[PDB]
């Protein structure tokens, strides 16, 4: 799980932020921290130094009100993947715009601004008589021929066969 951002995630104490761009996890320029597109989903990692020398992790995925389903779903999966690269030690948090945790809001000293837009998605009669009805149903018999375009199933084993060695 070799992603160049995963190598960086959670090394030093501090605040890392990525945006979901087209099924990818992309670093957000550090100048732009705190300004979220509300058409987008973000992944945020707070690394705090414990007094025991260990690193404390808090993994926030932030769903803009207009983010497309691929980006919010990607956000959450990346959150799980990142926790899992960090030995399951992160606490995972779902942050929806307008509903953020005080904790998450605490990371932005000047304070987080929203703003519109973002990156495009990675997706591309009378009495009922049955004999009248039932007649229709059995009235299509010689009508439907088979499909003629197909590759019938032989049972062909195309792959190499793993020997129980």
């Amino acid at each position: 799980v070799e992603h160049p951002e995963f190598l960086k995630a959670g090394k030093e104490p501090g605040l890392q932020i990525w945006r979901v761009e087209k099924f990818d996890l992309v670093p957000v320029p550090t100048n732009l921290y705190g300004d979220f597109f509300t058409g987008d989903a973000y992944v945020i990692l707070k690394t705090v130094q414990l007094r025991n020398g260990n690193l404390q992790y808090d993994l926030h995925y932030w769903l803009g009100n207009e983010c497309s389903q691929d980006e919010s779903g990607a956000a959450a999966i990346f959150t799980v993947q990142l926790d899992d690269y960090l030995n399951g030690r992160a606490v995972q948090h779902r942050e929806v715009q307008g509903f953020e945790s005080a904790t998450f809001l605490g990371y932005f000293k000047s304070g987080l601004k929203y703003k519109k837009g973002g990156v495009a998605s990675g997706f591309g009669t009378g009495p009922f008589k049955r004999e009248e009805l039932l007649d229709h149903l059995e009235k299509q018999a010689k009508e439907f021929k088979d499909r003629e375009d197909l590759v019938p199933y032989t049972g062909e084993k195309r792959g190499k066969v793993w020997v129980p060695k």
Partner: protein, 359 residues
């Protein structure tokens, strides 16, 4: 070329390409027999054919017929050469160890795919909702599960099963039409009880209330135009049919109802996560598609749980496809290439690789 996503349910195959926002193909998972036919064809021919469902209650049972289905999916429906596509598959919760291995083995051995992965359905649905934590109610054609998930992972000990599903709702719809004097038991008509189900049925906030509203008023009635032009009337049956989900006893079940099984699933989990589940209850699979079910389940859970509990049912309109969509996203991620079981790892480790790479 591109990754494939196959979500095999009991009544419908949902097949397509990773990265699309929907499956390119959806057809009945069935094999008919008088040679054989599959999927659409057989569905249309069944009056002449013996039908078989190779997956029963979300578990694969007949493996020869499941191969035939997978074959048809690749060549006839998706029209692809499977050796060229990594293929993601999906599985029921608690899928036996043995079915998992067989799935794996068939894919690499019968179909020769270069890579493959298998993923827990309820979990893909939770992801498609953009959550790592929540409790999923997955109710398909042939079976209904509650699956509590925490930080990305299902908790098996708390998974709750119900063998009552959309197929049974059809059957129960069948009979209340006959009792009201419309009799379709015949497989040609079978679709019609199914199609009536999908369209006029809905779930009532208060069951008995809607029943008195029913026989005192006629205002809840609706009618349906059949293919022969005929026109029939439908009563409380609209909302009697889905009511069996909360009141299994209508079909005789002593089993508890979906509100109860949700609740029993939540309470089997650890105390410190019960809040996150109560607040995230995600509905997925066609049998959850009924109007008024979300408002219902809410009120039943708003009842059965502590007065402080913040409660939400998430019922996204596309949820018929949620499982398939979670798959498409998963399979699209840049971080996903190493997650696959490659042909090389299969042929070193054999099929037992599925337990260590997929869980």
């Amino acid at each position: 070329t591109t990754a494939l996503v196959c979500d095999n349910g009991s009544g419908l195959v949902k097949a397509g390409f990773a990265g699309d926002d929907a499956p390119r193909a959806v057809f009945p998972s069935i094999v008919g027999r008088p040679d054989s036919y599959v999927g659409d064809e057989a569905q249309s021919k069944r009056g002449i054919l013996t039908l078989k469902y190779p997956i029963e209650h979300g578990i694969i049972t007949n493996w020869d017929d499941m191969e035939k289905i997978w074959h048809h999916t690749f060549y006839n429906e998706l029209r692809v050469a499977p050796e060229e596509h990594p293929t993601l598959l999906t599985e029921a919760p608690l899928n036996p160890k043995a079915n998992r291995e067989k799935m794996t083995q068939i894919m690499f051995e019968t179909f020769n795919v270069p890579a493959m992965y298998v993923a827990i359905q309820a979990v893909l649905s939770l992801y498609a909702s953009g959550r790592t934590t929540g409790i999923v109610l997955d109710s398909g054609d042939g079976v209904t599960h509650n699956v509590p998930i925490y930080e990305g992972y299902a908790l098996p000990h708390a998974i709750m099963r119900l063998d009552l599903a959309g197929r049974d709702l059809t059957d129960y719809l069948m009979k209340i039409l006959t009792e009201r004097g419309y009799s379709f038991v015949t497989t040609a008509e079978r679709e019609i009880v199914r199609d009536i189900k999908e369209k006029l049925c809905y779930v009532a906030l208060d069951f008995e209330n809607e029943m008195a509203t029913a026989a005192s008023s006629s205002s809840l009635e609706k009618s349906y135009e059949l293919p022969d032009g005929q026109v029939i009337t439908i009563g409380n049956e609209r909302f009697r049919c889905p009511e069996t989900l909360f009141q299994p006893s209508f079909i005789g079940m002593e089993s508890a109802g979906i509100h109860e099984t949700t609740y029993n699933s939540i309470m089997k989990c650890d105390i410190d996560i019960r809040k996150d589940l109560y607040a995230n209850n995600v509905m997925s699979g066609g049998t959850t598609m009924y109007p008024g079910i979300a408002d219902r389940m809410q009120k039943e859970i708003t009842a059965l749980a502590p007065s402080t509990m913040k409660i939400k049912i998430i019922a996204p309109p596309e949820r018929k496809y949620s499982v398939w969509i979670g798959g498409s996203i998963l399979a699209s991620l840049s971080t996903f290439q190493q997650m696959w079981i490659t042909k090389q790892e299969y042929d070193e480790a054999g099929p037992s690789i599925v337990h260590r790479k997929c869980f």
